[PDB]
């Protein structure tokens, strides 16, 4: 919903194959596409943790009453049957809710992955680039597939095009 309002591109790139989100370069070379492996691995890890959490739910067994005999205690066994059915129904609903929220969470974070990728791109591109606001940056230089690939790996240096760069704090 965020990208829709912010004018982020609503389509996707079939070339982005080694991952789920990443970068595109435009201009005159045509179009290059690169998957960012950090963001993709992060998404996969969140989903994996979510899976562990959903797989961790443990519930009590439903078995027969030990004292209630067939024929002799049919009314009790009917109430017992009702209890089993209602437990199964209710826990089913609750599970459907946990999974629904999990999936809502998964689908919602996409645009946030984009926002983070924009911050990573912003720092790497340096202060000579211009921020458009729709997830796109205007550069003074050319960026063919080899440049985008250097962006995805975080090895990109604007110095290689004789442009100013931000340095990184030694931590």
């Amino acid at each position: 919903f965020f990208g829709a309002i912010a004018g982020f591109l609503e389509g996707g790139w079939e070339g982005m194959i080694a991952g789920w989100h990443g970068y595109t370069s435009h201009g005159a070379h045509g179009v290059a596409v690169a998957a960012d492996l950090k963001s993709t691995q992060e998404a996969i890890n969140k989903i994996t943790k979510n899976l562990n959490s959903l797989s961790e739910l443990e519930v009590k067994n439903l078995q027969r009453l030990s004292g209630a005999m067939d024929e002799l205690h049919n009314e009790i066994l009917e109430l017992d049957e009702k209890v089993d059915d209602l437990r199964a129904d209710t826990i089913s609903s609750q599970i459907e809710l946990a999974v629904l929220l999990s999936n809502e969470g998964i689908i919602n974070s996409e645009d946030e992955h984009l926002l983070a990728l924009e911050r990573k791109l912003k720092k790497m591109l340096g202060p000579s680039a211009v921020d458009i606001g729709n997830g796109c940056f205007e550069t003074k230089h050319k960026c063919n597939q080899t440049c985008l690939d250097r962006i995805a790996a975080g090895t990109f240096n604007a110095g290689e095009f004789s442009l100013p760069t931000f340095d990184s704090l030694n931590i």
């Binding site: 609503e10 996707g12 991952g19 989903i47 005999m69 067939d70 599970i95 999936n103 984009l114 591109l125």
Partner: protein, 343 residues
């Protein structure tokens, strides 16, 4: 040049539900459910699993074991989980019983709901010296040992008047004491024998119907007998007989005495059942084949893969998947995006 953040586009046949976007198409999912297939039953992994009450007792049925039929008395192992394979347990020998006239068939199913079941080593009542003149303990060729042609159920004593000039009697009362530990329930087996007019005269000195009443833990049961005109013998020893027995049980909680009021033809309790704990019981079938993580009433034995399962819900014990109404999926990809193109 212009450089932008973007998201992939791939085939997206999988669907998941969301709260704010409805159903959405996605590139990949992790299925969370499966539908099990019907398999044979098995042992519960990490839990000894009971089938027949006394597995060492061959050719014997669970009812036979529960009544203490001759040749069919042996060890009944403890178990924390049990399979109910007979909703109407049948006998396969000994004296003809009119089963459907009481709740007796359900006796072995009651026993399996306990963890530990043992047959007492001492008799709960001295039958020879029991009220109503001295008795001889009746026997029959229908109930043979391996070292005898004749015998009778270990749980009961066929009390028949010993002396000549035997007569009709008023209703007499015996107390049945609790002879198990303070941690054990006692299951007391009792009943009555009846026959045709002449044999009734011979055996008991009365040819009229006899009356019987039991009282234990607030429950009273009353029975009146039948003289002749019995239904055909079934589930018995194969020997023709002119009479029939009716058999019942009383449950006595620890420290609770029960009573029986009886006339002629009484089958007095002897060895009683001592039972403690609880076993998790579900319906299933026999033989138990192999090990499994989970026992399920509609699918049999199964091992757990996915956390949930779809299909038919039923009682199930062990390390089991949780039933859900619908085949749920966890999204493991991105929402569908139409391919973007240049011109």
């Amino acid at each position: 040049d212009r450089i932008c953040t973007g998201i992939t586009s791939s085939n997206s046949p999988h669907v998941v539900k969301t709260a704010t976007q409805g159903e959405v198409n996605v590139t990949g999912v992790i299925p969370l459910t499966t539908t099990p297939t019907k398999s044979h039953f098995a042992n519960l992994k990490g839990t000894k699993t009971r089938g027949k009450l006394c597995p060492t007792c061959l050719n014997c049925t669970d009812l036979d074991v529960a009544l203490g039929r001759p040749m069919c008395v042996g060890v009944t192992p403890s178990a924390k989980a049990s399979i109910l394979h007979e909703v109407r347990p049948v006998t396969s020998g000994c004296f003809p019983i009119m089963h459907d006239r009481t709740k007796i068939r359900q006796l072995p199913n009651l026993l399996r709901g306990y963890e530990k079941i043992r047959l007492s080593t001492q008799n709960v009542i001295n039958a020879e010296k029991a009220p109503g003149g001295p008795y001889r303990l009746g026997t029959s060729g229908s109930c043979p040992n391996a070292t005898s042609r004749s015998g009778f159920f270990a749980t009961m004593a066929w009390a028949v008047p010993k002396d000549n000039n035997k007569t009709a009697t008023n209703p007499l009362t015996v107390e049945v004491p609790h002879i198990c530990t303070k941690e054990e329930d006692q299951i007391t087996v009792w009943g009555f024998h009846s026959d045709d007019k002449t044999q009734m005269k011979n055996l008991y000195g009365d040819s009229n119907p006899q009356k019987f009443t039991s009282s234990a833990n607030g429950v009273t049961t009353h029975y009146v007998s039948q003289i002749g005109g019995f239904p055909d013998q079934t589930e018995d020893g194969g020997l023709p007989q002119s009479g029939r027995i009716v058999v019942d049980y009383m449950v006595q909680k620890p420290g609770k005495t029960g009573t029986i009021v009886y006339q002629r033809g009484i089958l007095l309790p002897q060895k009683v059942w001592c039972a403690s704990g609880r076993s998790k019981v579900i319906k299933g079938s026999l033989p138990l084949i192999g090990e499994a993580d989970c026992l399920h009433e509609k699918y049999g034995g199964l091992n757990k893969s996915k956390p949930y399962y779809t299909g038919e819900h039923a009682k199930a014990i062990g390390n089991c998947p949780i039933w859900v109404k619908t085949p749920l999926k966890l999204a493991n990809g991105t929402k569908y995006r139409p391919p973007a193109k240049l011109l």
